[PDB]
Amino acid sequence: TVTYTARVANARFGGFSQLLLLWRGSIYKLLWRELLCFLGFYMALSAAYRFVLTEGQKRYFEKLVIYCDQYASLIPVSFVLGFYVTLVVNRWWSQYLCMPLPDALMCVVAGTVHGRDDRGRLYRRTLMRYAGLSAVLILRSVSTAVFKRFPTIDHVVEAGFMTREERKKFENLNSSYNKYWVPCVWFSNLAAQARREGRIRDNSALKLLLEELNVFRGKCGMLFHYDWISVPLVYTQVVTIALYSYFLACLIGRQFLDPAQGYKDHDLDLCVPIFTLLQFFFYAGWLKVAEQLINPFGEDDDDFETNFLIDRNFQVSMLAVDEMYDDLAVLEKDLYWDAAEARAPYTAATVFQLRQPSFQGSTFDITLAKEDMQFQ
Amino acid sequence: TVTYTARVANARFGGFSQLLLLWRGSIYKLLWRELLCFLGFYMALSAAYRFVLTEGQKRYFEKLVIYCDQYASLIPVSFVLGFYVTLVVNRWWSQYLCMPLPDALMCVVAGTVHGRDDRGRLYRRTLMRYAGLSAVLILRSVSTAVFKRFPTIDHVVEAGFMTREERKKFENLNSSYNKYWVPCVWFSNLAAQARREGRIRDNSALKLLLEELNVFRGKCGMLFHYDWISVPLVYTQVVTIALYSYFLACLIGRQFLDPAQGYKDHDLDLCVPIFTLLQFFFYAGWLKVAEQLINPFGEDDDDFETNFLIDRNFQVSMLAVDEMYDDLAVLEKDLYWDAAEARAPYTAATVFQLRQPSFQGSTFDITLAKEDMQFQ
Amino acid sequence: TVTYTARVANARFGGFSQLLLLWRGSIYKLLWRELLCFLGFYMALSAAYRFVLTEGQKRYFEKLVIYCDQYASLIPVSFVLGFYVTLVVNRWWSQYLCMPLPDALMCVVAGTVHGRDDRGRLYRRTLMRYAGLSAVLILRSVSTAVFKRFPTIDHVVEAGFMTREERKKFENLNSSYNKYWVPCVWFSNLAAQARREGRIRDNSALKLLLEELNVFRGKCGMLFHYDWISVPLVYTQVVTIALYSYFLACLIGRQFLDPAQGYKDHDLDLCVPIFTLLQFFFYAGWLKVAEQLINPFGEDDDDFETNFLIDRNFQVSMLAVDEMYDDLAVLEKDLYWDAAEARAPYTAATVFQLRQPSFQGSTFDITLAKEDMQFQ
Amino acid sequence: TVTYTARVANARFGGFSQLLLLWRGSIYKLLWRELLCFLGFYMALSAAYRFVLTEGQKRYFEKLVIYCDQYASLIPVSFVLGFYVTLVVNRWWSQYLCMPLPDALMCVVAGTVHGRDDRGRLYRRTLMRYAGLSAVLILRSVSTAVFKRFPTIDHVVEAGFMTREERKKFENLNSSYNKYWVPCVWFSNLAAQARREGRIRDNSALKLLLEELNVFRGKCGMLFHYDWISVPLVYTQVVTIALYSYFLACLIGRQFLDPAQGYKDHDLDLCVPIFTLLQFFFYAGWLKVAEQLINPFGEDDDDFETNFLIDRNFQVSMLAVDEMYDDLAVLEKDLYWDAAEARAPYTAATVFQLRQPSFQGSTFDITLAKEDMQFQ
Amino acid sequence: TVTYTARVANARFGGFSQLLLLWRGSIYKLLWRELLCFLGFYMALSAAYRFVLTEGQKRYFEKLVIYCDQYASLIPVSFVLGFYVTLVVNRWWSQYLCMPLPDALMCVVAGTVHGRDDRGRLYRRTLMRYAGLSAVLILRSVSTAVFKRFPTIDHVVEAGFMTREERKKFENLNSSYNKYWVPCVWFSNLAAQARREGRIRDNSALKLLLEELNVFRGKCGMLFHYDWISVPLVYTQVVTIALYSYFLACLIGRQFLDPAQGYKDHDLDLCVPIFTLLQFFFYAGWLKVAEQLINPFGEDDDDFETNFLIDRNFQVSMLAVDEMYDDLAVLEKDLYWDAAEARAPYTAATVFQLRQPSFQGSTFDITLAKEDMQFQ
Ligand SMILES: N[C@@H](CCC(=O)O)C(=O)O
Ligand SMILES: N[C@@H](CCC(=O)O)C(=O)O
Ligand SMILES: N[C@@H](CCC(=O)O)C(=O)O
Ligand SMILES: N[C@@H](CCC(=O)O)C(=O)O
Ligand SMILES: N[C@@H](CCC(=O)O)C(=O)O
Ligand SMILES: [Ca+2]
Ligand SMILES: [Ca+2]
Ligand SMILES: [Ca+2]
Ligand SMILES: [Ca+2]
Ligand SMILES: [Ca+2]
Ligand SMILES: [Cl-]
Predict the structure, then answer these.
(1) How far is CA D81 from CA B62, C189, D242, D275, D279, in A?
(2) What is the tally of structural domains in chain E?
(3) Min Cα–Cα distance to chain A from C358, Å
(4) Do B120 and B202 share a structural domain?
(5) C5 within domain boundaries
(6) E206 and E116 fall within a common domain
(7) Distance C295 CA to ligand 2 centre (A)
(8) Topological domains (Extracellular): residue ranges (chains A, B, C, D, E)?
C-alpha cells in the first residue's frame, strides 16, 4: 500500500502537485509502457504521413484523420470509466474491509478463555492460531503474494500456523472444496471443549466467542466470494473496448496535418500532441486505477500488503492472548481522581486549539425575545 | 462465473487488453448476433443507396441521413445506461450476497449440538440438511439451472435433501405460497427439541442457532424477493428504447454518402463504419452487462454457479457437523510457544517484502521542535 | 409487481427487445396519454404553421423555432433525471425491504413459545396475529390498496386480524397518533406473560422474541416514515419543471420548417418528429419510472402487491406456529449417512455443469520455481 | 414535512404536473425572490442596452454579450449540482433516520420493567421520560424550532420532561460539553436499579434494555455529529460559486441583441428570456433543494417536524409503558382457529386483486422434456 | 470543523450567498495562492504576447492559443472530479463515523460495573481510561494535531491517560506493530476481573461490556486502516493531472487575442479572464474539497477537531462512570402522571406549529363509496 496520508494532512499550496512526484503506486509506473506504445503508434503514423505516403496518399490520410477526429467522443468514455472505476474502487475498499483480523477475537479470548497454566495458554494460543490459519488459507487462496510465501500446505506447517497433526486431520478431510473453513470448525469445537472444561466460565462468553468466530469466518468467506465472483468480464471488456476505441480515434484523428492544405482546425503543427498525450495519460490512468484495484491481493504497489498483515495479526494475537492475559497493572487512582473536571495538558504547538469556543449545538445563538419565550 | 481474478492480480502491460481475447462470459459471445443484425441493416441500407435507389431517391436518402445524424445523441444514452446498469450491477452483487450458505450455521451446530452417538450425528446432520433443503427449495424457485436439476420435489427427495416422510409432511401443508420457509420452521422446532433433550447444553447456544437460522432464512427470503420484485419493467423498457433509438439514428445517420455530392462531414467513404460498429459494440455491450446480470440465476456464463454452490454447501456442511465434530488434534504447543515475538518464514520469492518499513501511522515522521513538545 | 425475471434469465438474442412487447407495468401504459398530448400540441402547431399562419407570421414562427431549438439542452435534463430517479429507485427498494414480514418471528415463535394444548396454540397464534395486525394497520395507513380493503377498523375486525375485545382496547387508547405500534406493545406484553407462565422456557428465548419483535416494529415504523417523509417536493418540482422545459423547447424547436426557406439544419420535412417523439418517450418514461416508484404502495402495476403479502404472511405465519409446531418427521438417517463425500444427482439437462473445474482460488495456477518455494 | 405521498400513489396522467400547483414546500416559495432578483438584473441590463447605452456603447455591450454566452457552460454546473445535492439529500435522509424514537425502548420497557403498582409505573414512565428528555435536549441543541419551544432548561422542566430535582442534578454536573447524554446515563443507572430490585426479572432483559438505550443514545449523538460536522463549507462555496458563475454568464449572454445588427444566433427579440428564466428556475431550484435539506431541523416546510415528533414520542411512550402495561385482551381463539388455510375477506374495490396468479418463483413455467428430467 | 449549520437552518433569500462571505474553512483560504499563481502565469503570457513577442511571434502564439482552446475539455474534468471527490467525501464522513467515542461504553459501565467504594470507582474510571487511552494512541498515530499534543508516550503518561506502571507494561510488550489495541486487551482483562470479583453482577453484562469494547476497538482499528490505506495514489494523480491539463489548456487558450487579427470567437479583449478565473476557482475548489477532506485528521479548518473530542470524551466518560454512578434523583411522579394524554406546552414563537393536522398516513383521505367498502 502506498500510504501518502501524511503528505495530504493539510490542504497545502503544493497539495496534490507534490504527489505528482511520487513513483511507487504512481500513474507513471502503471502507464509509461502504454504511453510509449501510444506515442510509438502516433509517431509511426506521423513518420508515414510526413516521409512515406505520396501526395494522393497524404490527401487520403488527411480525409481519414478528419473523419476519425469526429469519433473521438470523450463523453461516453468518461461516463463508462466513471461508473466502472467507481464500482471497482468501492469493491476494492469492501475487499479490504473483508480481510479477516483477530482483534475482536483476541479481546474476547483474553477476556473469556481463562487459566494462567500451560493448558490455558494452549487453549488461547490455539484459538487464535486457528483464526490466523483460516486467514492464511483463504489468503494463499486469493493472494498471489501469500501463495508465493505458502506455495504448499507444508509451507504453512513449517511457518507454525498448522501443526503436523492438524495437517494430517486437514488432509484426511474428504472435501474437493477449499478448506479455509476447517480451522473455523476447529475453533468452534475447541471453544465448546473449553466451555465444557470450564476454561470459559459462562455460556454467554462461549456465545460471544462463537459470534466473533462467525464474523471472522464471514470475512474469510467474503474474501473467497470476491475472488471467485469477478467484476463481470463483459463489463470489463466493454470499458476496455470503449477506451481503446477512443484511443484509436485519437491515434488517427489527432495526427497533425500540413497547415499548407489549409484544413479547418488543422493550421498548427506541434509534431507532438501534448494535449492528446495528456488526455491519453488521464483516461488510461483512470482505467489503470481499475486495473490495479480489480484484484487488490496481487503484488502491485497499491495492492494490499497481505504478508505484513499475516505477520502482524499472528504476532499481535499471540501477544494479546499469551503475554497480556491477566497481566494488568494494579488498579491505582488516575491523575484526575480528585478533579471534578478532566483535561490533559496541551503542548505549545497545539495550545492555539484552546480558547476556540466549545461547540454545544447550532441553536445556542438564536437570542429570542422575552415574549416569544413564554409558554402558551 | 467467469473468474479472471488471477489474470488481473497485477496491473501488467497487457492488463485488460488480454481480457479482450476471452470468449466465455465475453462481450463477443453476448453481442455477436446483435452486431451482425446491426451490420446487416447497415449494409442493407448501404446496398439500397448504392445500387437500388435512383438519383432523386439517393438525394432524399442523403437528406434523411444528414437529418438522422443530428439525433444520434450519445450523451443521454450514456447517462441512462450508466445509471440503469449501475443499479443492475449493485442489485446483482446484492443478490450474490443474499444466497444462503451454511457456514455460520455449521460453525454453530458443530459447536453447540453435541453427541458422538448416532442421535447427535442425526441432529447435526438433520439441522444442516434442513438448511440445505431450504436453500435448494428457494434456488429451484429462483434459479433455472437448479430447476432443471430439480424439476420436481421427487427430484429433491431422490437427491437426499428431503426424506420421504419429510416430503409427506411438506405436501400435507395446506399452503398455496412457496414453502421454502418450511425447512426453517423444522430447523427451529428441531433446535428447540435438541435443547429440550440437552443436546444443546445451554439456552444461549439455542439462541445462537436460532439467530444464525434467522440469517439463513433471511437470505432465502431475500432471494425470493429479488426474484419477484424485478428491476421495474418501465425502467428497463426506457433504457432499451433509449439504446435502440440511438442505434436507429446511427443506423441511418452513419450511412456513408457519396463524396461526389460534397456534403459537409461526408467526404470519405470507408464502406464500413468501423467507429460506429465500435460505438454499437460499446453501448450494446454496456446494456448486455445489465441483460446478463438482471437475472443472475439463469444459465449464462457470468450467471451464478448455483448447482456448484448447492453441492459444495451440502458436502462441506455435512463434513463440518459429522466428520469434524469433536475431532480436534491434541492441544500441543505451537512453533512460537517460547518466542516473545512471532513471525513465519518468508520464501525467496516474497523475502523482498521484508525490510520495507512497518507502517505505524501517518504522524510518526513529524519531527517537532523541543520547545513545541512542552505542555502548557 | 410485474415480474419478468424468467424472461431475462439468460442474455438471449431477443433479450430486452421482447420486453418491449409487454403492456402491464410498461412504459406504453404509463406514457401513451402524455405521448398523445405531446403529439397533439406538436401537430396543433404544425397545422397552425402550415395552414393558419400568414407568410410574415410563418417567418416569425420559424425564427422562434430556430431560437427554441437552441434551448433544448438534453444534458441538464439527463443529469437531473439520472440523479432524481436513482434516488427514487433506491428509496423504492428500501421501502420494499422495510415492509414487515413475520418469517423471523415465526421461526422464533415456533422454536420458543411452547405447548401442544389449546393455550400454547392461542399464545403462538396470538403473537403472530399481533405481528400481522401491526403490519395491516401500518399498510392500511400507507397503502391505498389495503385501505380500500380495510376502510375501517371494523373491516380489520371482520377480517380476523383484530378481535372485538382487542378493538375495544385499541379504541379506548387516548392517542391522537397512528396506533400501528399498539399490537407490538401487546406482543411485548404477551411474550412477557408467556415467559412468566413458562411457555417460553428461557430468558434468552424471550430476549430473542423481543429482538425479532423490535425488528418487525422497526419495519412498520419505517413504512410510516417513508410515507410521511416524501422525496422533497422542491426536488420533484425541479425535475418536473426541467423535463417540461425541455419538452416545451422540443415542442417548438422540433417543428419542421419549409425546406423552401432554406434554413440550415431544416431542409427535410418528415411531418412527424420520429426522433423527437422517441426522445420524449425516453425522457418522459424515465420520469414515469420515478412517478410509478415514488409511492410504491399505490395500486399501479409495479406498485407492491401489499394485499397478496398480507394474505401470504397471515396464512404462512399461522401454519408455522400452529400446524407445524413440534411436528417433525422422525430423525432418520439421510441418503448420505455412510458416504464420506456428499453429492446429489444431476439431471441430463444440467449434467454439463459437471466436469467444469471446481473453483479453489485465483492463486492455484501460479506454478512457481523450486528455488523460489524455499523459506529464507 | 410537506407530505404528497397520497397525490403520487398511482402514476396518473396529471402525475407530477399537479405537484407543480403546490405552494408549501415548493420551488416557487423557495425561489421567487431569487427569480425576481435575476429578472431585475436582466431587465436592468435590458433597459440599459435599449434606452441608456449609446451606439458605440451598444456595440461594445453586444460584443460582451456574445463573449459571455460562450462561458454559460451548463454541463459543469449540472455535474457539481448533481453530486453535491445527491450528497445533501442522502445526508438529509440519514439525519431523519438518526432522530431518536422510543418505539424499541417502549416495547422492551413494557415487556421487561414490571409491576402494576405505583413504583412499577414510576420506573417505566421514568425510563421513557429519560429517553424523551435525552431526545429533547439533543433536539433543542440541533433544532431551531425546538430551541424556540425550549429556550431554557426551565422550559424543559415546565414541560414535564425534567423534574426540579433532576434539573438540580443536571446543572450540578461540572461539564462544559453538551449534556444530552446525561438522561441516558440516568437510564442506564435506573435500569440497573430496577434489575437489582427485581423489577426487571432477568439479566438478559436488562441487557436488552441497555442495547436499546445504546441505540437511542447513538441516534441522539448522531444528531449532534450531523449538526456539528456540516457538509464542508469549501464544497458548498464551490457549488454556490459554480451556480452564480453560470447565472452571471446567463445574465449577460442571454441578453437579447438587436436583430438589426444581424448577429448570428441573435435574430429574434422576445424581450423576456422564457427559456433562460426556466433554466434559472431549474438550476436555482436544484440548489434550493440542498439549501432546504442542508439543515433539516430548521423551520422550513420540508424541514423535519421535530416538535410534532417530540409530542408524539412522549404521548405514545407514556401510553405504551403506563396504560398498556399488562393490559391484554383475554387470549381467545381468532377467526381462523379451525381453518387449515387463512385469508381475510376482500372488498368489492380490491376483489379484482384476487384471481391474479399467486407468485411462486421465476422457474415454475420452464416445462422441461421427460428425458431431461432424469437424473444421471 | 467550520460549523455553519445555524446559518442554513432555513432556506433564506441570502441562503448560500452569505456563506460566500466566510473565510475560515473557505474556498478563498484554500485556493487564493493557486488563484494568484494561475493569474500570474496568465498575465505573464499576456504581457509576453502584448509587449515582448514580435509580429510573427504574436501570430504563432495566436495559432497556439486557438489550438489550445480546443483541448479545454471541461466535461472529462467535471466527470473525474465528480467521481473522485464523491469518493473522498464519502470516505471523509466514514472516517468521522469511525472515530471512537466512549458513549456506549459509559452507559454500559455506569449500568454494569458496580460499587460506591473506591474500588468500584477505580474499576469504572480505569475501564473508560483504557478506552480513552486506546483512542488517544490511535489518534496520535493518525492525527497530526494529536501527535503535536502527544509527541511521546511520556506526554500521554503526563496527560493522565496512561499510568507509569501501565507505561512499563506497554513498553515491555515485544511488538513492532502499533499498540493502540493494548488498552483494549487491558479492558477485556479488567472487565473479566470485575466479573470474577462480582463487580459485574451478571455474565450478560460482561458480554455487553465486551460487545461495546469490540465496537470501540473496531472504530480505533478502522481509523488505523483509513490512515494506512490511502485513496489510491494512481487515482489521485489521475485527477490532479486531469485538472492541471485543463488549466494548462485554459492558461494558453483563454489568452485574449487582438481583435485586430479578426479571429473568430476572439473579438473582445477584457485583459482579465473573469469567467476563466471563475472556472479555475470552481474546478480548483472542487479538487480542494478532496485535498482538505483526503486526510481529515490534519490541522486544517474542516479537518476534525480531534483534540476537542479527546478532551470531551475523557471528561464526559469520567463524569458518567464516577460522579453520575448510582446518583439518581428519587423516582417521583412526572407532570403527566394523572393525564391520559401527554403534551408539553408550546411557546408563543412555535404555537403556530399547533393546529396543523397531525399526520396519520397517506390513505386517510380516500373517501371510498359505501358499495366498495363491503367485503366479498
Ligand atoms: N505482497 C503484497 C504486495 C503489496 C505491496 O507491495 O504494497 C501483496 O500481497 O499484495
Ligand atoms: N448452472 C449455472 C450456470 C452458470 C455458469 O455456467 O456460470 C447457474 O445456475 O447459473
Ligand atoms: N393492490 C396492489 C396493486 C399492485 C399490483 O397490482 O401490482 C397494491 O397495493 O399496490
Ligand atoms: N417546527 C418544525 C417546522 C417544520 C415544518 O413546518 O415542516 C421544525 O422543527 O422543523
Ligand atoms: N487540531 C484539529 C484542527 C481542526 C480544526 O481546527 O478544525 C485537528 O486535529 O484536526
Ligand atoms: Ca491488482
Ligand atoms: Ca442472466
Ligand atoms: Ca406508485
Ligand atoms: Ca433547512
Ligand atoms: Ca486535511
Ligand atoms: Cl445474548
Answers:
(1) 41, 50, 9, 19, 13
(2) 2
(3) 7
(4) yes
(5) no
(6) yes
(7) 36
(8) 51-59, 255-273
